Amino acid sequence: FKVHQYFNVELIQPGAVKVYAYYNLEESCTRFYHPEKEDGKLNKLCRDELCRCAEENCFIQKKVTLEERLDKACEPGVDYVYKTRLVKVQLSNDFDEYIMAIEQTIKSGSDEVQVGQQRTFISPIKCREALKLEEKKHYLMWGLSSDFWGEKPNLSYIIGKDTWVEHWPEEDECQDEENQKQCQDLGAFTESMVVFGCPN
Amino acid sequence: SCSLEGVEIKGGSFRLLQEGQALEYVCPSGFYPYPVQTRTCRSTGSWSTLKTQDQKTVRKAECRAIHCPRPHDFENGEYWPRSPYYNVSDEISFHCYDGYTLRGSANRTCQVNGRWSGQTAICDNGAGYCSNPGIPIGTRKVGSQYRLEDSVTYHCSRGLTLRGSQRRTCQEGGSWSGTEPSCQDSFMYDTPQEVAEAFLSSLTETIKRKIVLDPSGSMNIYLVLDGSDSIGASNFTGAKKCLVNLIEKVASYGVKPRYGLVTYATYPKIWVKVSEADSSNADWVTKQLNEINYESGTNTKKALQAVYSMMSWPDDVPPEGWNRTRHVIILMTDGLHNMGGDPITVIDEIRDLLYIGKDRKNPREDYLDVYVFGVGPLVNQVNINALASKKDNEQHVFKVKDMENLEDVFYQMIDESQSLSLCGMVWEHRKGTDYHKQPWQAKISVIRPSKGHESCMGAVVSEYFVLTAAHCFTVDDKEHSIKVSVGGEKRDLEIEVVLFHPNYNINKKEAGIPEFYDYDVALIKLKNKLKYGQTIRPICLPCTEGTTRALRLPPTTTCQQQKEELLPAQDIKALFVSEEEKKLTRKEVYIKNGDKKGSCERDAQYAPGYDKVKDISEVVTPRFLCTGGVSPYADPNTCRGDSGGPLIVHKRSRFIQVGVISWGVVDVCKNQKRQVPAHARDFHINLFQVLPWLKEKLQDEDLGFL
Amino acid sequence: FIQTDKTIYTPGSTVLYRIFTVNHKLLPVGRTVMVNIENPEGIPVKQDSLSSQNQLGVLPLSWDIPELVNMGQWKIRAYYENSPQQVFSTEFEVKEYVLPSFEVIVEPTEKFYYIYNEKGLEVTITARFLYGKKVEGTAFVIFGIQDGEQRISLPESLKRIPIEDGSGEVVLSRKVLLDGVQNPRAEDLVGKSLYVSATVILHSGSDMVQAERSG
Amino acid sequence: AEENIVSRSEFPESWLWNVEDLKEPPKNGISTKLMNIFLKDSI
Amino acid sequence: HRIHWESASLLRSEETKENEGFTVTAEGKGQGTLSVVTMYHAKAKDQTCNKFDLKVTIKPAPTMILEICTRYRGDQDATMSILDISMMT
Ligand SMILES: *[C@@H]1O[C@H](CO)[C@@H](O[C@@H]2O[C@H](CO)[C@@H](O[C@@H]3O[C@H](CO)[C@@H](O)[C@H](O)[C@@H]3O)[C@H](O)[C@H]2NC(C)=O)[C@H](O)[C@H]1NC(C)=O
Ligand SMILES: *[C@@H]1O[C@H](CO)[C@@H](O)[C@H](O)[C@H]1NC(C)=O
Ligand SMILES: *[C@@H]1O[C@H](CO)[C@@H](O)[C@H](O)[C@H]1NC(C)=O
Ligand SMILES: *[C@@H]1O[C@H](CO)[C@@H](O)[C@H](O)[C@H]1NC(C)=O
DSSP letter for each residue of A101-117: EEEEEEE--SS---TT-
Q: Are B249 and B414 contacting, i.e. CB atoms less than 8 angstroms apart? A: yes
Amino acid at B568: P
Considering only CA atoms, give the Rg of chain D.
17
Return d(Cα B264, Cα B336) in angstroms, integer.
12
- Cβ contacts of B367 within 8 Å, gap of 6 or more: B323, B325, B326, B327, B354, B356
Q: Are B260 and B328 contacting, i.e. CB atoms less than 8 angstroms apart? A: no
**Cβ neighbours of E16 in B, within 8 Å:** 149
> Exposed (0-12), middle (13-18) or buried (19+): which is B434, by Cβ within 10 Å?
middle
User: Residue B308 phi/psi, 5° resolution?
Assistant: -55, -45
The verdict on a CB contact (< 8 Å) between E51 and A17 is no
Using alpha carbons only, give the angle C14, C15, C20 rounded to the nearest 5 degrees.
145
Cα dihedral C196, C202, C205, C209 sign: negative
Q: Which atom of ligand 2 is nearest to the CA of B106?
A: 14
**Element at B307 (helix H, strand E):** helix B300-311
Using alpha carbons only, give the angle B626, B631, B637 rounded to the nearest 5 degrees.
55
DSSP 8-state class, residue B413:
H
User: Residue B567 phi/psi, 5° resolution?
Assistant: -130, 80
With touching defined as 3 or more inter-chain CB pairs under 8 Å, the answer for chains D and E is no
CA distances from B38 to B6, B10, B25, B58, B406 (A): 14, 14, 7, 14, 20
Resolution to one decimal, Å: 3.2
User: Residue A154 phi/psi, 5° resolution?
Assistant: -80, 55
The verdict on a CB contact (< 8 Å) between C160 and E10 is no
Q: Are B467 and B458 contacting, i.e. CB atoms less than 8 angstroms apart? A: yes
Q: Helix, strand, or coil here: B23?
A: strand
Using alpha carbons only, give the angle B562, B563, B567 rounded to the nearest 5 degrees.
120
Length of chain E: 89
A111-119 long-range contacts (CB < 8 A, ≥24 apart) are A111/A148, A111/A152, A111/A153, A111/A155, A111/B341, A112/A152, A112/A153, A113/A80, A113/A82, A117/A153, A119/A82, A119/A84, A119/A155, A119/A156, A119/A157
Pairing of strands B368-372, B326-331: parallel
Whether ligand 1 lies within 6 angstroms of the CB of B634 is answered as: no
Half-sphere exposure of residue C38, counting CA atoms within 13 Å on the CB side? 17
CA distances from C25 to B290, C21, C31, D22 (A): 86, 11, 15, 21
Amino acid at B553: L
Whether ligand 1 lies within 6 angstroms of the CB of B65 is answered as: yes
Inter-axis angle of helices B300-311 and B344-353, to 10 degrees? 10
Inter-axis angle of helices B282-289 and B239-250, to 10 degrees? 170
Write the CATH number of the domain with boundaries A44-196.
Answer: 2.40.50.120
Return d(Cα B165, Cα B158) in angstroms, integer.
18
User: How far is C-alpha C25 from the chain's CA centre?
Assistant: 32
B503: left (phi over 0), alpha (psi -120 to 50) or beta: alpha
Q: Are A130 and A79 contacting, i.e. CB atoms less than 8 angstroms apart? A: no
CA distances from A75 to A72, A192, A196, B161, C209 (A): 6, 16, 16, 20, 54
- Give the other-Cβ count within 10 Å of C159's Cβ: 17
Using alpha carbons only, give the angle A150, A156, A157 rounded to the nearest 5 degrees.
130
DSSP 8-state class, residue A58:
S
CA distances from A110 to A59, A163, B298, B434, B464 (A): 24, 16, 14, 50, 65
Return d(Cα E83, Cα A1) in angstroms, integer.
14
Q: Which atom of ligand 4 is nearest to the CA of B214?
A: 14
The verdict on a CB contact (< 8 Å) between A23 and C199 is yes
**Cβ neighbours of A25 in C, within 8 Å:** 208
Mutation pick from D16, D17, D18 vs chain C, by most beta carbons of C within 10 Å, is D17
CA distances from C38 to A139, A187, C9, C59 (A): 67, 75, 15, 19
Return d(Cα A173, Cα A190) in angstroms, integer.
18
CA distances from B196 to B172, B199, B353, B427 (A): 31, 5, 30, 9
Return d(Cα B393, Cα B382) in angstroms, integer.
19
Q: Where are the beta strands (DSSP E) in A63-114?
A: 78-90, 96-107
Q: Are E68 and E55 contacting, i.e. CB atoms less than 8 angstroms apart? A: yes
Cα dihedral B43, B49, B52, B54 sign: negative
User: Residue B640 phi/psi, 5° resolution?
Assistant: -60, -45
Could you tell me the strand order of the sheet in which B91-96 lies? B77-80, B91-96, B107-109
Q: Helix, strand, or coil here: B549?
A: helix
Pairing of strands B326-331, B219-226: parallel
Return d(Cα B316, Cα B313) in angstroms, integer.
8
The verdict on a CB contact (< 8 Å) between D14 and C60 is no
Which of B29, B32, B87, B673 should be mutated for ligand 1, with most atoms under 8 A from CB?
A: B87
Return d(Cα C59, Cα C20) in angstroms, integer.
7
- Cβ contacts of B245 within 8 Å, gap of 6 or more: B407, B410, B411, B413, B414
The verdict on a CB contact (< 8 Å) between C60 and B144 is no
Q: Are B63 and B37 contacting, i.e. CB atoms less than 8 angstroms apart? A: no
Q: Considering only CB atoms, which residues of chain B are within 8 Å of chain E?
A: 147-150
Return d(Cα B464, Cα B497) in angstroms, integer.
11
**Cβ neighbours of E10 in C, within 8 Å:** 43-45, 47
Q: Are B66 and B30 contacting, i.e. CB atoms less than 8 angstroms apart? A: yes
DSSP string, C131-172: TS-B--EEEEEEEEEE-TT--EE-GGG-EEEEETTS---EEE
**Cβ neighbours of C58 in B, within 8 Å:** 98
Considering only CA atoms, give the Rg of chain E.
28
Return d(Cα C72, Cα C65) in angstroms, integer.
13
Cα dihedral C151, C157, C158, C159 sign: negative
- Cβ contacts of B548 within 8 Å, gap of 6 or more: B554, B555, B557, B562, B704, B706
Q: Are B648 and B589 contacting, i.e. CB atoms less than 8 angstroms apart? A: no
Q: Are B149 and B194 contacting, i.e. CB atoms less than 8 angstroms apart? A: no
CA distances from D2 to B63, B185, D10 (A): 21, 21, 19
Whether ligand 2 lies within 6 angstroms of the CB of B80 is answered as: no
C103-112 long-range contacts (CB < 8 A, ≥24 apart) are C103/C127, C103/C128, C103/C129, C103/C130, C103/C209, C103/C211, C104/C128, C104/C139, C104/C198, C104/C200, C104/C209, C104/C211, C105/C211, C105/C213, C106/C141, C106/C196, C106/C198, C106/C211, C106/C212, C106/C213, C107/C213, C108/C213
> Exposed (0-12), middle (13-18) or buried (19+): which is E74, by Cβ within 10 Å?
exposed
Return d(Cα A134, Cα B305) in angstroms, integer.
40
Rounded to a whole number, what is the distance in Å from the CA of E28 to chain A's nearest CA?
A: 48
Pocket of ligand 3 from Cβ distances under 6 Å: B 234-235, 293
Query: Which residues of B are annotated binding-site positions for Mg(2+)?
Result: 228, 230, 298
- Ligand 4 centre to CA of B323 (Å) is 7
- Cβ contacts of B598 within 8 Å, gap of 6 or more: none
Pairing of strands B465-469, B521-526: antiparallel
B89: left (phi over 0), alpha (psi -120 to 50) or beta: left
Considering only CA atoms, give the Rg of chain A.
21
Pairing of strands B441-448, A29-33: unpaired
3-state secondary structure B598-667: HHHHHHHHHCCCCCCCCCHHHHCCCCEEEEEECCCCCECCCCHHHCCCEEEEEECCEEEEEEEEEEECCC
Return d(Cα B336, Cα B330) in angstroms, integer.
14
DSSP 8-state class, residue B365:
G
Amino acid at B616: I
**Element at C92 (helix H, strand E):** strand C88-94
Supply the residue whose CA is at minimum distance from atom 1 of ligand 3: B235
Torsion of CA B204, B206, B208, B209, to 10 degrees: -10
Q: Are B291 and B263 contacting, i.e. CB atoms less than 8 angstroms apart? A: no
Preceding amide of A153 cis, omega within 30? yes
Return d(Cα A76, Cα B27) in angstroms, integer.
28
Q: Are B629 and B596 contacting, i.e. CB atoms less than 8 angstroms apart? A: no
Length of chain D: 43
Pairing of strands C88-94, C8-9: parallel
> Exposed (0-12), middle (13-18) or buried (19+): which is A114, by Cβ within 10 Å?
exposed
The verdict on a CB contact (< 8 Å) between B341 and A110 is yes
DSSP 8-state class, residue B179:
P
Return d(Cα B226, Cα B299) in angstroms, integer.
9
Alpha helices by DSSP H, listed for B107-266, are 192-203, 239-250
Return d(Cα C26, Cα B453) in angstroms, integer.
58
Amino acid at B273: K
Amino acid at B83: S
Preceding amide of B28 cis, omega within 30? no
Amino acid at A140: L
Q: For residue B681, which of B618, B613, B606 has the smallest C-alpha distance? A: B606
Pairing of strands C8-9, C2-4: unpaired
- Cβ contacts of A200 within 8 Å, gap of 6 or more: B228, B229, B230, B296, B297, B298, B335, B337
Q: Are C93 and C8 contacting, i.e. CB atoms less than 8 angstroms apart? A: yes
B189: left (phi over 0), alpha (psi -120 to 50) or beta: beta
User: How far is C-alpha B422 from the chain's CA centre?
Assistant: 20
DSSP 8-state class, residue B529:
P
Q: Are B480 and B547 contacting, i.e. CB atoms less than 8 angstroms apart? A: no
Pairing of strands B101-103, B209-210: unpaired
Alpha helices by DSSP H, listed for chain C, are 174-180
Q: Where are the beta strands (DSSP E) in B27-90?
A: 31-34, 38-40, 62-65, 77-80
Return d(Cα B157, Cα D9) in angstroms, integer.
12
Q: Helix, strand, or coil here: B305?
A: helix
Return d(Cα B306, Cα B58) in angstroms, integer.
43
Mutation pick from C4, C62, C76 vs chain B, by most beta carbons of B within 10 Å, is C62
Q: For residue B439, which of B534, B529, B355 has the smallest C-alpha distance? A: B534
- Cβ contacts of C38 within 8 Å, gap of 6 or more: C44, C45, C74, C75, C76, C77
